[PDB]
Structure formats: structure tokens, C-alpha cells
């Protein structure tokens, strides 16, 4: 699998592939690895499927209970801290997973969390099997002066290169941009195909 | 006759403590709610009499989910504790099944929680009454809760000091399918007729849902138009 | 004389609290049931007096399995809790043995549950009475339950405020093997003769089973034909 | 004088609650049993007065094993719970040792269970009395049980409302070695002389064992020949 | 063993073989691996026999208790979520099983669940030892414009190819089609033999 | 004055419940025992008044080991439970140390068991008194037990309804070293002088041990020679 | 060891050998592996001796308690379900045993249960070390149109071939036929020797 | 009427023990607080009457975090225990979420802690009242706590012996947005008007926070300038 | 070590050697492996010394408590069942022991119990290191028409052959015959030496 998350000026973009395997044997050509975790932040998945889905369910529950008890969204540092404490309360029966949470509260963030519960800030991060490819292209082409369209084009080029050069990843890319103004929005697949045909990465 | 101390049966077959809890919730704030054409509302009288109270920050209509809300009446501390139990129970059902498919399950678990402290000794019952409102897969539902844990389903109900006066007005003047504007108008007329014995009402607090969207609690300005 | 507070023996050998629970279930809703030629029915009087009550959604005939049903009388909260215990116990027997082979086992476990809170201090008895009905491998069975946990098997029985009047009519006019239509007619005449002291009956709620198929609860329209 | 509330010693050295349980079992159904030449019987008066009761399905002679049976008297709910305890205890001894070698061990464990709630506070005594009958390796045994947990071994004994009248007839007219037919005849004459104060007996229920075979409960037709 | 589940327009079709082994040594020429779990959904079995039967018993119990407490059938996403939570509450004493649940509530679904509790949607799925064969033929011949008869013929051809080319599978095929209109119905074996003799796959 | 309800200290320094247990054991069966030249005996009056009681099968002299026996007086149910505790405690010492080297250890553990229910609330004391007899490595020992858990060692002692009359006869007429025949004769004369107020004795039950061999309980025929 | 159980028209026949070892070293020339579990059903043994005997004791206890609490015999599907639940409540401290229960309630059944608790219906089944031999001869000669005498002759021929070609089995065969009419009856050994001398399998 | 012993409901629906705790906190030290333009203050009257008391070392304004403080009134021991519970609860939220984002969560957990000992028997309620003050992400907040566990949010509130007199002065003379100097002057005038009935005030203790920085408790010299 | 137990007409004979090692290194030339467990039955020892002695202590305790609570001796099937349940309640912290209990209640019995708790009847049984030798001679010379003297001579010849051909066994043989008439009696060693010198097996 592969994930990607990029912080730019006033927005943060996350995208994944959708191919779940669950054997060697690619088994599901259309999974779901990107999850809206709250009205201003989301979460990606790059590990064991069942453990990852249970973590997504628990974090949805805890953030909704949070927002209702306090009537404000949770800070991104707080949700990363909570996730790290949850993963490090049990590490000798551990969750084999690599998580990546991004969002915006007063400033955009994207945080990486390993299986041992190490949370760390960064401006662009990625996890999964084909992750070094997208780190290569993000290191080569990334600028923090980009717009939202330039950013999502960079993301599509990245995941396209990962699908070209990795066995485990593949399938149709989906992308969701989260900003402070318009909130969480997932791009429709027709727009994604339009950007792919514009950039000339289709075969 | 027998014990007015702790919950046992009487010679007339009456749980005295659960009675005494019902007169405790009769001493509380009045609040009501009703279904309308494609949803349900909840309006509470506001217990503001000091100007030092942070008017809008004291909410008696509290959210349990984005798809179940609750307004309470009775002892305010038992109210807060029970509402938090309802919140975490809704979260449990979200964890287990994936969604809150029945709001009736949610009122039933809370009512079982109240039945236990109706059942056992060493503890008093919950002296609090609540009404639950929201849509589920079935549709708009409006419940009530009782210090015994009795639940009943309504199209419109009340709670509090103005229980009976409001319920008499609702018994006369309720229409089943009703647009939201005329619904909140009818609800305010109900709240008026009872609470206008201190010859004042105030701005009340009022929330609503329609099927297919989330929760909306009014602001201070919108309610005074219907006032 | 001795304690009317908590369940101990008296000088006359009487559990006072379990008595007081029996007069608590005498204050409840009347309901009855009877076997017919190849099954059994259950009819409940409906406690509807407000028009705001969601008439059909309040059910006192509740299902325990697809092959055991129950109608209750007494304190409604204790009723709901006990009925849920019966539901999960039937599910336990489905897990363990593969099927619900005896409905008598199911009433006996619930009756033991009531006997415990008859037996111990620190808690009052369950002030509720139920009748169970359904077919098993043996055939149609009709049980009763008592605040002590006493069970008895009937061909026809009652419960509630109209216990005695209904049981007198059944004692006179019951026929053992009876087609379903005449059976529900006889049951309604029973419910009439008692509950027609407020000079009204209403539409009651009524369910039935025949051997070899599942459960059928009537709708609002069908019961008024037999009314 | 001291407490008629809960089991403590009195100034006259008397456990008042265990007394009050004994008058509770005096208010029950009469039943008796006796040994005969190579076995033992148990006969119970049947508490049938309604025609709606499913006559044969209500059994007061209940089996604990294929080689121990029991008939009870007193509170019927405590009876059922205690009989089920005896059943699972007999099954425990079948698991552990391979067979039920002594029926006296089985009555002693049940009697210890009754002694405990005679002993502790926070619980009333078991208001129930039972007699046990069956053969073991030793031979035919006939026991009795008491709300204190007292056991005694008999050749013939009674229990219930007709305790004393029956025991007087048995005290006069019992013969030790007796063929089964004349034994059940003598037992019915005993049950008659007491219970014929309401000037009726009915068909009673009656079971028997001979050494070397299993249990036989009569049917409805056979008992009326000896009636 | 092998299973198959296919979602089409307004119905979903599931079928299994019936041969249980329980040693190398094929031992039972007529088992039972397809189970009606509720009046509008069913479940298949592709793992360890005892653990699988205990899971079937528990899910029958929980769904019947559900339907009686709430008087409505459970959504398919909800039953997959419940099954995933049950399997992932214990994974270090795990159930060696591959499950596949399908059904219809307002739209047909068929969900695959591994031993670790990873639930994922798909339109056609399969599990078992001979599963790659039926994935091959379903990938080659499957269309979503099929009718119920075309679908069940595709299913019979699939399981026929799996019996031809796999050691573990075999025995008489049984098939049950579940639709919204007629509810759960299992096809009689005479109709199944008629379809086999029609398609010409018998020897 | 203070509580005759539950075991607390009085203003005169008296545990009222343990008193009330002592008058409970005064209401029981008389029994006694004495040492002789190389052993000790135990004789019990037999509580047979019905002919239906299985005379020999009711034993009040019960064995704890092959080298400790016990006869009891008081409440018979508490007697049976306490005697079984003594049996399993002797078996514990057989497991742990290999043999029952001191019978005084065995009476002390049982007496601690009675002291606890003398000590705590929520429970009454054991209303039972026992005497223990047997040889150990030290030799013949004869103990007594008290509802408080008080133990005393005797050469001869009594218990029961004829406590005082028997103890007066023993106080006058006991000789320390005595052959077994004259010992059981002296014991029967003791039991006579007290129990011959109902102008009957009966055949009593009586056991004996000499140092160096196991237990011997008499039969029905042998005791009537000394009668 | 070896077992056998055959369902025919209105009766079911079970038989075992009697040789228990308990080392390599055959140790007991006359054991007991067939057990009447209830008045209309019985149980065989093909595993570890102690665990198997404890299972027999427990099932005797539970079925007798059942029959006394409910005054009816247990269905064969119910007793197999109970046995499967008991074996699968503990599988990581498992019972090394292969069980086979047969009986008749309204129709004859014989069920096989492995060590993991997999219950499955069949019309003829066998367990033990010499089990493939009797599966061979039952597959070759079995018909469901047999009588009771033809069935028990088939059983004796089967166990005779197993004793001829297996090391672990041996000793004197015992057989018990259970029918609805006459109840559980174990054949006397003189009749068994008569059938052996009739079929001509003695040496 | 019913029990003034332990917390149960009364005939008038009143928890008597929680009342008696409220008159216990009426017997305490007066203290108050109010918001100002960009923060909040807390001033306590000092209970110094001996010269042997180490004046400054007795603090009734105690810190819960660097961003929540508390001043208490009532029983001083219950005060100290409850304040320590609040401290460790704030530390729990720091460990779990990373920061103390809502001070309302912190007062609600402490209020639930007080509700429990309002709810259960076997224990009296906390006879103590507190006000909490500090900024969070939302901004300046000022709470109150009640022996029932009732919380209310204020712009200005009081507690103690001078509850009512101070609250009357605040009800008249409070201005919402106010610079810190005039704020502490208004607060001292409030504390004066009440506590100047013993015709003395003393130097009080007083702390403050502005948004964006930590806590500042005054020293002895600074408060006398505003005195 | 070695044990032996032989059932004949109205009596049962058990005997062991007495040599305990407790290293390779034979350490105690006179142990005790035969134990009177009750007035009409006894027990032998063929395993780990400490565990075996604890089992002997426990069974003495339980049978004496039994005889006192019920005033009758325990049946041999009952004591074997109790011993089997005790050994099979803990088998994953097992007792490394082979037990053999014999006695008479209305008919003589001798039962063998392994470490896993498998109880089985037999008419002659043996355990221990030199056990196959005494099984050989008992198979060769045993008849059930023997007298008590012929039986005890057979036993002495058996254990003599085991001492001649086994390393672990040895030391002075002791023998106890248990019958219904005279109860448990252990033969004096002078009579044993007399029988050895009569049979001519001494060197």
C-alpha cells in the first residue's frame, strides 16, 4: 500500500490508493484507506486491515464524544497524543500498523505515527510499501509556495509513480483536500480522472 | 405506609422513593418537545433570573449524538451524570455496530440504568426526567423518561413544573403534520400559557432536526422572532 | 406482623414484600391468553388514554424468540428488564443446545431469577407478572409467572386488574379444542366483560401462533373485525 | 422475644425465623411416603381445584436421579430451586465417583445448603420441607428435610397440612414388611383420613421403586383402582 | 474448500461446495458450509470447521436477538463490523478462518472478512483453497448486466472449474440466491443438476 | 441489657447471644463420657420416641477419625455441620503431617471456628456443644466444647438436658482408674439417675476405645447386658 | 484403535475393537471404547484414554440431567452441538481425541467430531488408526437398502479387515445396535463369535 | 420529613443531607471572584485571628494547574481532599490529551465526584463549595461548585458566610469589561461591605490571571495598596 | 522399578521390588512402593517418587474421609474414577507417574492408570521399567484356575525374572495378598525368603 499527506499554506492534502491484499494475491481492487475522522481532520491507513479499521472506529468515536462534550474540535497535536498513548499502552501485543493523521485547526498539520506510538510533526509525510517513491518525488518537486491545484497535481503524480513502480499499491486513486474554509471535501473520481488525463499519466 | 425511607413495596403497592423522585422532578424546570412534518423539536424554558449567569453557556438541551439530543428536568446534577451516561452509551453502539440505528435502544439502556437504582437498596433513585428526540433509520422519534425508568413514545410531550398545563394545551391544540415554523410557534404558545403565571416568559432555548441532516440549535436572535 | 419492610417470614408464615408485589401487579393492565386447537393466543388490553401516545408502537405483547412470546402486567420498568433477561436467556439456549426445545425451561430460568430477589435482602422482589406462550417440541404451552417466581401451566389464564373477573368468565366458558377465530372471539368476550366497567374497551392487541409456523401479531384493522 | 425479624437466638433459645418457616411449611400441600417390602413409595395430594390447570403436567413428585426421587411441601418456588440444587448435586457425585452410592450423602448436602441460610444474616431460611426416597447400595431409604436442615430417617413419614393427622394414622397402622399393593392402599387410607375434611380426596399422584429397577410413576388410570 | 459470492443488480448469489476434510483423507462427502444467517442475508465458511461453526451459531444468535430487540434486520455493514470486532478482540488466540457474508438491505452487498477481522466491500468475492480459479473465471466472464439465471450459471461454471482443478474442493454443489422480493431461497438440488446438464459440465 | 439481638458486650460484660446459645444447648439431648484405665468411653441418650425412626441408623456418636470420636448436643443441624468440619480438619492434618498426633489440636481448630461466629456480626454463634474423646500419642484425652469455643479437659463430663444432674453424680462417684466394664456401668448409672425422671431410660448408644487399637461402637444386644 | 458407525433405514449400528495402548507395547487386551450415552444414543472413543473417559463421564452426566429436567431425550444435533461447544471452549489446551456419536430420535444419525469441535452429519463414519481400511470396505460394499443383519455383518467384515491390516487395533470386537423400537442393545459376544464363524473370518 | 439521617428523598422532594451540607458551607469563610477585561481574579477573606498562625503559609487560593486555580469554602478537610482530586485529574488530562483545553471538563469531573457521594448511602456528601477560575482555549471562565455537584458559570460569584451580602453588591455594581485594577478594587469593596460587620476586614489574599500568561498570586504588600 | 498385580478367583495379589533411584546411581536399597490404601484395597507406585507419595497421602486421606462419612468402603471403580479425575484435572503440569490400584469389594479387581488418567480394567497388570518381563512370564504361565499359593509363587518368579534382567529394579521383594475373608495382609519377609528358597531362584 501507499499513503501521502502534504501540508501547504492554508490547506492540507491527503490521498491513498485503493488496493487491499489480505494475501499475496491482490484481492480487493477497491478498498478504503482514507477516513474522515472529524469535520476538520482525517486519517490514512497503512498497516494490518482489521487492526487499522478498529483504530479508525475508536478514533471516530472518541473525537465525536470529544466534540459533543466540549463543543470544539480537537487539536491535531492532541489527537496524535491520544493515538500515541493508545498505541503505547499495548506494545507487546502490538498493532502492526503505520498511521498518518492530518488536519487543520488554526494551522495545517500532518503527523506520522509508527506502530510504537512515535508522533512527530512534518510538512509532508508518507507511509506504506511504496512510500519511498513518493518521498523521492516529493523531495524532488515539492515547494511550500504551491497552490491547492499544484499540490493535488503533485500528489497525483506521486501516487502515479508509486503505482508504476510498486507491486502492492495500485487501483484507483482517491484524494481528499481539507481546508479551514470549506471543511473536509473528497474530490469526485471524475475530477481525478480529469487531472490524470490532463497530466498525461494514463495508460 | 411502609418505608418512606428506602425503596420497598408499600401495602398499597407503591414505591415511595420513586414517588418522591417524581415530585422532585415536578419541582424542576419546564421543557417540552413535539414532532413536526419531517422532524422533531425540543424547547426548554431557561432558568435565568440573575444577570450574572452566562446566559447562553448554560444549556439544558444537550447533544447525545449528532443524531440524538436531550433536554432534562429535575435535579440538575443527576441530570448531567445521566446525560453523560447516555453519551458514552451512544458511543458504545457506534463502536460496536457502526451506527446508531435505533434511538429506542438508546433510551432503553438509560432507562435500565434508572431501573437499577429503582431496584436496589443502599442508594436512592435518579431524581431526574428527560425526553429524547431525533431521527433514526425508522424516522423521527420522541421519547420520555421517568424516575422509575418508564419510557413512553409521544408525538408531543412535556416535563417539569409546567407538566400538566402544557400537556393540557398540547392535548387540545396539537396537529400531527405541521411545518417547522408553525410547529415552533405552537410549542412557544404552549410554553407561554403555562409559564406566563409569573407574567414573563423570556427567550427560551430551542433546537430542531429535519430528516436527512444534522443538528441545529437556534441562536439568541432567531428565537425572539418566534417569541 | 413482621417485617413489612423487607422479605422475612412473618408469624403467620407470609412473605410480606412478595404479597405487596402481588397487589402491585393487581394494580396493572389486564391481559390474558388461551390455547386453541393447534396453538395459543395472547391478548392485552391497551393502556391508551392520551391521543399523544404512539398507539401501535407501545407493545405489551413482546417477542422472546420467533418461538416464544410474552405479555406482561405490573410495574412496566421491571417488566421490560425481566423480558430482556428472558430474551438473552433464550439466546443462550440457542447458542448452547442449538434450539429452544422446551419453553418450560425458559420460564423456569426467569422464575429462578425472580425467586432470588424474593430470597435475598438488600433488594425488593420483582413486582411484575407475565404469561408465556408458544409451541415447542412438546407442543403448545401456556405459562404464568408470579412475583415469588411461582409458575403454573394453563389452558387459559389472565393477569392484571381484571384478573378475577376474566378468570371467572374463563372458568365458566372455556372449551378446550377450538378454532382460532372462535378462540379470539371468546378471548375478546372475556376481556370485554371485565374491562367494560369503564364502559369502553378499545381495540386490543393480540397475537397468535399455530404449530409449524412462526409468529403473527395482528394489525390495527384485523382486530376490529373481531371487536 | 428477640428478633422475629432475622435469625438470631432468643432468650428461650429459639431461632424465630426457622420457626416461622416451619409454620410456612405447615400451610402447604400434604404428602407422604413409606417403605414397603423391597422398596419405597411417595404419594402426594394434588393441589388441583381449577379445571384450567394442566392436571398431569404439574408434578410435585420430582425425580432427582433415576435412583432418587423427591416430593416437596411448603413454598413452591423455594421447592423448585432446592430440588434443582439436589439434581445438580447428584450429577456432581455421578461425575466424581461414578455412581450415587449413598442417598444419605445427597440429603445431607441439601440439608447443609438449608443450614447455611439458617445460619447467616442477609437471607431468610428456605421455607420448604422435602422427603427423599430411593434405593442405594445400602437399600431402601426414606428421609425427611426440615427448614433448619434437620434430617431424619423413617420407615414412613408425612409432610404438609396433614402432617399430624397422617402421622397419627401411620403411628397406629404401619406394618414394616408389606407388599406394594397393600402398601399403596395403606398410604391412600392415610391420605384419606386427613384430607377427607373437605369431604373429597381426588386422584393423588404416587410413584414407587423396587430394588433392582428404575423409577415408575403411575398414570391417571392406575391410581383410581387403588382409590 | 471453496466459496463464491456475486452481487448483481437487485440480488446476490452465494454458493459453496460440500466436501469437508478434517484430514488429508477427504472424510465427509456432504458437509454444510452455506448458512442462512438472517431472513435477508447469509454467510459462507472457508476455514477451520469447529471455529467456523461456533462463529455461525454466535452470529445467528446475535442477529436474531437484534431483530427481536429492534424489529428490523441488521445492515450488512453492521454485521460485518460486528464480526470484525469479534474476530479482532482475540487475534493472539485467533480463529483460523476466512469468512464471507453477503446480503441485501436496500442494496446488495457481499463482504469479505479475513482471520484478522479486515472487512472490505466488493462486488464479487471468494475464499477457500480453490478460490483463485473462481477469481480467474469471474474476472474473465463477469458482467454486472447479468440476470439471475446468467449469474447462477456463471457461479456453477466457476465452482465446476474449481472442482476440476482443485484437490480439496469437490462434492455436490449447493447454491442459494437471496433477493429483496422473495427473500432467502436455496435452490433444490434437482434444479442444480438440471443447470449442470444444461451447461454440459457433468462427467 | 445491650443487644439481645446480636453479639456485643453488655454493661455487665456478657455476650448475650452466646448465653442464648448455651440455653439452646441446655434444651438438647443428654450425653456423657469418661476415661477408664486405658481408654475412654462416650455414651449418648437416644432420642427415640417414635417407632418409625430407624433406631440404629440415627447416630449421635459420630467418628471424626479412626482415632477421634465425638458425641454432640444442641441444635442437630449445626451439630452435623460442625462435625463434618472436624472430620475434614482431621483429614487435613493427616495430609500435612502424616498422622493425628494431638487430639487437642483438633478440638482447638473447631473451637476457633466457633469463636469466629462468636466474634463477628452478621451471623449467630453455633448453638451446639460437643465432647471429643480418643487416644493420641499423649494418651487418652477427653475434651468439651462450648458455644463460645471454650474447651476444657476432663476425666469425665456431660452435656445436654441432664448436664447438672449427671455432673453431680460424676462429681460424687467417679474413680480415676477403672476397668471398662465397671466404667460403662458407672456411666449408665449416671445416665439413669438423670434421665429416669420420665421413668424410662431406653437402650443408650455407647462406644469405647482402649489404647493401641481402633474404634468399637457397641451393638444393640451388648448394651442391654449393662442396662 | 478403530471405530465404525453406520446409519441404515430405521436403525444405526456402532462397533469398536477392544485393545488399549497406552504404550507401544499393547497393554490391555480388553478395553472399553463403546459407551451408551443415553437410552437412544451412544458414543465411541478414538483418542487419548483419560481425556476420552472424562468426556464420556461429563456427557453421561449432562444428558441424564437433561432428561430429568425436561423429561425428553436430547436430539442428536443438540448433543453434537453441545460436544462441539465443549471442545471448542478450550482448544489451546486441547483434548487429543476423535469422537463419533450416533443415535436415533425421529431419524437415525451418526455424527463425527474432531478434536477442534467440527460436527458434521454423515451416513457412515469412522475414526481411529485403522479407520481408512473400514472406509475402504464401507465405500466398496455399503448400501442403504440393507437390513440390520446385513449391516452388522458388514460391520464385522470391516473391523475384521482393520484387525487384519492394522497394528494398533485388535482384540475382541463388540457391537451394539440401537433402534427406536427396542432401544439400546449390545450384542452378546456369543452371537458375535457366531457371526464371525458364519462369515468365515476366524483364524 | 424523611431521613435527616442519610441521603434519601423526602415527601417534599428534598435531599436533606445535601441541604445540611449547604448550611455547613454557609458556616465557612467568605470568598469571591470575578472576570475582568482579559482575565479573572479570586479573592479570599483570610481566617486569621491568632497571631500564632503562619499568616501567609495558610493559603485558601490553591493552584490546580498553572492554568486553573481554586478558592474553597466549607469544611477545610473535605476542601483539601477535593482540591487534591482536582489536581490529579488535571494531571490526568495533561497525560492523556497533552493539554488542559477545557476548564469546564475539569469542574465537571470534580462535580461528578461530589454527585457520587450525594448519590450513594454508607457515606455523607462533601460538605464543601469551590469556585474555579482560569483561562482555557475558550477564554476566561469562572465556575462554582455546590455540595450536590451543581455547577454554574458566572461573570462574578461568591461563596461562604458572606454569600448573600456579597452577591447583592455584585448584582448591583458589576461591570462586565473592566481593567484589572478597578476589578480588584470592586472585589475588595464587595468583600468589605459584607465582612465589615465585625468592623475590620484584614489584608485579604487575591490572585489573578490575564490571557496569555501564567498565574500570579499577590504578596502581602501589594494588596494593602488596594485595601 | 517394577510392579505387578494379579486377580485370581477370590483374591488379588500385588507385589513390588524395593529399590529407589532418585539418581542413576541406585541410592536406596530398601524403599517402599506398595501401600495399603484401605482395609480392602491397596496401591502400587511406578513413577516419580515425590509426586507418587503425595498421591498416596491424598488417596489415603480421601478414602478414610469417605469411609467415615458413609460407613462403607469405596468401590474399586469409584477409586479409579476419582484418581483419574484427579490426574486429568492437571495434565499440563502433569504427574510423571504410572499407578496401579487393586482390591476387592464384591469381586476382585486390579486397575491400571497412566499419567494422563486412563483407567482400564484388567485381570493382570504391571507397570515400571522392568514391566515387559513380568508381562511376558504372566502371559506364558498365568492361569485363572490358580490357588493363592500358586499365584504368589508366580508373582515371585515374575519379579525374580525382572530383577535378573533389569537394571533399575532389584532389592528385596515384598508381597501383600488382599482377600475378602482375611482382609489386607502383607506377607512377612521370612515367608518370602522361604518361597524363594523353595522355588530355587536365590543366588
Curated annotation (Swiss-Prot), chains A, E, G, I:
Molecular function, one GO term: threonine-type endopeptidase activity
Enzyme class: hydrolase
GO cellular component, one term: proteasome core complex, beta-subunit complex
Biological process according to GO: proteasomal protein catabolic process
E.C. numbers: 3.4.25.1
InterPro entries noted in UniProt: Ntn_hydrolases_N, Pept_T1A_Psome_bsu_arc, Pept_T1A_subB, Proteasome_bsu_CS, Proteasome_sua/b, Proteasome_suB-type
Reaction equations catalysed: Cleavage of peptide bonds with very broad specificity
Family according to the record: Belongs to the peptidase T1B family.
Role of this protein: Component of the proteasome core, a large protease complex with broad specificity involved in protein degradation. The T.acidophilum proteasome is able to cleave oligopeptides after Tyr, Leu, Phe, and to a lesser extent after Glu and Arg. Thus, displays chymotrypsin-like activity and low level of caspase-like and trypsin-like activities.
More about this protein: The configuration of the closed gate contains an opening large enough to allow rapid entry of tetrapeptides but able to impede the entry of proteins and longer peptides.
Entry protein name: Proteasome subunit beta
Species this chain originates from: Thermoplasma acidophilum (strain ATCC 25905 / DSM 1728 / JCM 9062 / NBRC 15155 / AMRC-C165)
UniProtKB/Swiss-Prot annotation, chains B, C, D, F, H:
Extra information: The configuration of the closed gate contains an opening large enough to allow rapid entry of tetrapeptides but able to impede the entry of proteins and longer peptides.
UniProt cross-references to CDD domains, sorted A to Z: proteasome_alpha_archeal
GO cellular component, one term: proteasome core complex, alpha-subunit complex
Keyword presence, Coiled coil: no
Biological process annotations from GO: proteasomal protein catabolic process; ubiquitin-dependent protein catabolic process
InterPro entries per the UniProt record, alphabetical: Ntn_hydrolases_N (IPR029055), Proteasome_alpha (IPR050115), Proteasome_alpha-type (IPR023332), Proteasome_asu_arc (IPR019982), Proteasome_asu_N (IPR000426), Proteasome_sua/b (IPR001353)
Subcellular localization, as worded in the UniProt entry: Cytoplasm
Family: Belongs to the peptidase T1A family.
Subunit structure comment from the entry: The 20S proteasome core is composed of 14 alpha and 14 beta subunits that assemble into four stacked heptameric rings, resulting in a barrel-shaped structure. The two inner rings, each composed of seven catalytic beta subunits, are sandwiched by two outer rings, each composed of seven alpha subunits. The catalytic chamber with the active sites is on the inside of the barrel. Has a gated structure, the ends of the cylinder being occluded by the N-termini of the alpha-subunits. Is capped at one or both ends by the proteasome regulatory ATPase, PAN.
The protein's name in its UniProt record: Proteasome subunit alpha
Modification after translation: The N-terminus is blocked.
Keyword vocabulary terms for this entry: Cytoplasm, Proteasome
Native source species: Thermoplasma acidophilum (strain ATCC 25905 / DSM 1728 / JCM 9062 / NBRC 15155 / AMRC-C165)
Activity control, per UniProt: The formation of the proteasomal ATPase PAN-20S proteasome complex, via the docking of the C-termini of PAN into the intersubunit pockets in the alpha-rings, triggers opening of the gate for substrate entry. Interconversion between the open-gate and close-gate conformations leads to a dynamic regulation of the 20S proteasome proteolysis activity.
TM region(s), chain numbering: none
Gene Ontology MF: a single term: endopeptidase activity
Amino acid at each position: 500500500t501507499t499513503t501521502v499527506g502534504i501540508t501547504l499554506k492554508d490547506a492540507v492534502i491527503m490521498a491513498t490508493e485503493r488496493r487491499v491484499t489480505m494475501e499475496n494475491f491482490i484481492m480487493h481492487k477497491n478498498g478504503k484507506k482514507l477516513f474522515q475522522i472529524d469535520t476538520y481532520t482525517g486519517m490514512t491507513i497503512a498497516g494490518l486491515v482489521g487492526d487499522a479499521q478498529v483504530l479508525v472506529r475508536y478514533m471516530k468515536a472518541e473525537l465525536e464524544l470529544y466534540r459533543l462534550q466540549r463543543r470544539v474540535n480537537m487539536p491535531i497535536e492532541a489527537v496524535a497524543t491520544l493515538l500515541s498513548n493508545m498505541l503505547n499502552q499495548v506494545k507487546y501485543m502490538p498493532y502492526m500498523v503505520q498511521l498518518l493523521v492530518g488536519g487543520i485547526d488554526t494551522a495545517p498539520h500532518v503527523f506520522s505515527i509508527d506502530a510504537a506510538g512515535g508522533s512527530v510533526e512534518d510538512i509532508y509525510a508518507s507511509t506504506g510499501s511504496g512510500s519511498p517513491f513518493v518521498y523521492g518525488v516529493l523531495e524532488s518537486q515539492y515547494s511550500e509556495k504551491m497552490t491547492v491545484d499544484e499540490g493535488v497535481d503533485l500528489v497525483i503524480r506521486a501516487i502515479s509513480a508509486a503505482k508504476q513502480r510498486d507491486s502492492a499499491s495500485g487501483g484507483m486513486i482517491d484524494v481528499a483536500v481539507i481546508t479551514r474554509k470549506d471543511g473536509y471535501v473528497q474530490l469526485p473520481t471524475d475530477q481525478i480522472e480529469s487531472r490524470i488525463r490532463k497530466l498525461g499519466l494514463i495508460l | 405506609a411502609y418505608d418512606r425511607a428506602i425503596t420497598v413495596f408499600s401495602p398499597d403497592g407503591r414505591l415511595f422513593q420513586v414517588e418522591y423522585a417524581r415530585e422532585a422532578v415536578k419541582k424542576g424546570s419546564t421543557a417540552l418537545g413535539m414532532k413536526f412534518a419531517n422532524g422533531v423539536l425540543l424547547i426548554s424554558d431557561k432558568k435565568v433570573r440573575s444577570r450574572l449567569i452566562e446566559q447562553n453557556s448554560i444549556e439544558a438541551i444537550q447533544l447525545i449524538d449528532d443524531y440524538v439530543a436531550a433536554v432534562t428536568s429535575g435535579l440538575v446534577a443527576d441530570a448531567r451524570v445521566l446525560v453523560d451516561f447516555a453519551r458514552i452509551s451512544a458511543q458504545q453502539e457506534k463502536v460496536t455496530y457502526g451506527s446508531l440505528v435505533n434511538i429506542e435502544n438508546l433510551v432503553k439502556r438509560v432507562a435500565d440504568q434508572m431501573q437499577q437504582y429503582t431496584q436496589y437498596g443502599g442508594v436512592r433513585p435518579y431524581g431526574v426526567s428527560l425526553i429524547f428526540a431525533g431521527i433514526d433509520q425508522i424516522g423521527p422519534r420522541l421519547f420520555d423518561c421517568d424516575p422509575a425508568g418508564t419510557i413512553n413514545e409521544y408525538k408531543a410531550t412535556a416535563i417539569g413544573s409546567g407538566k400538566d398545563a402544557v400537556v393540557s394545551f398540547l392535548e387540545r391544540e396539537y396537529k400531527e403534520n405541521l411545518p417547522e415554523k408553525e410547529a415552533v410557534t405552537l410549542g412557544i404558545k404552549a410554553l407561554k400559557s403555562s409559564l406566563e403565571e409569573g407574567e414573563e416568559l423570556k427567550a427560551p432555548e430551542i433546537a430542531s432536526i429535519t430528516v436527512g441532516n444534522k443538528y441545529r440549535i437556534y441562536d439568541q436572535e432567531e428565537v425572539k422572532k418566534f417569541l
